[PDB]
Amino acid sequence: NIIXGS
């Protein structure tokens, strides 16, 4: 989940 927590 490396896209702003998602």
């Epitope: 490396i2 896209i3 702003x4 927590g5 998602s6």
Partner: antibody, heavy 119, light 111 residues
């Protein structure tokens, strides 16, 4: 609806720089916050980012000497940098991103705070 | 790694200028790319987010385009007010080295 960096000023080499990003008219909690600096006559340089959902990420050069912390109680984001040199003399900016969906659509920029590390 | 070329470009008033931005690796979802305008002594200003969407209050003579590893900012009908340095910022992830700033392109307007 603006962000502001705390006071910089005069530092000796080997000092520690501590800066706080404060918001007025909206919130920093839940929004991405970035730290950028600009040495005299040079380009913008990323220092690190406070993700909107808790993750803190840096460029490699900064990961050893910079640490970035969020305070959701006080609605602030802070930057601490160790082992200062004259090369760290620059204007330091913080900025807020309204929409996470843009990732780097950084919207509200502070006026910048001047940091002089004098040899 | 974002490479911006050229470092500097002079453009006559009224002409069109194009600023190039080379991402060594494609930005996330092919669209995490923003453009900024900075005049000396001032904070940066957001011009375009998501490759081509203009920020509010930005005139339509600014045009962002590109995809993958290559992006362009086009300023038509250049005025002296456009004298500034322009930056692209690309995002890949929320990790180490996971966003990058271009080195900037200084636009000198010839009056």
């Amino acid at each position: 609806q603006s962000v502001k960096e705390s006071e910089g000023g005069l530092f000796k080499p080997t000092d520690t720089l501590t800066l706080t990003c404060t918001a007025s008219g909206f919130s920093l909690n839940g929004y991405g916050v970035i730290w950028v600096r600009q040495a005299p006559g040079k380009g913008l340089e990323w220092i690190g980012s406070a993700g909107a959902y808790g993750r803190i990420y840096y460029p490699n050069w900064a990961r050893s000497r910079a640490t970035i912390t969020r305070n959701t109680n006080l609605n602030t984001v802070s930057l601490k940098m160790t082992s200062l040199t004259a090369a760290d003399t620059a204007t330091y900016f913080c900025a807020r991103r309204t929409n996470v969906s843009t990732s780097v659509g950084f919207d509200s920029w502070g006026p910048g705070t001047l940091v002089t590390v004098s040899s | 790694d974002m490479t911006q070329t050229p470092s500097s470009k002079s453009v006559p008033v009224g002409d069109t200028v194009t600023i190039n931005c080379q991402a060594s690796e494609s930005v996330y979802s092919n669209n995490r790319l923003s453009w900024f305008q900075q005049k000396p002594g001032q904070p940066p200003k957001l011009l375009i987010y998501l490759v081509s969407t203009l920020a509010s209050g930005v005139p339509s003579r600014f045009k962002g385009s590109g995809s993958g590893t290559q992006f362009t900012l086009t300023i038509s009908d250049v005025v002296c007010d456009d004298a500034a340095t322009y930056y692209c910022v690309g995002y890949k992830s929320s990790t180490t080295d996971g966003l990058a700033f271009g080195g900037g392109t200084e636009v000198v307007v010839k009056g």
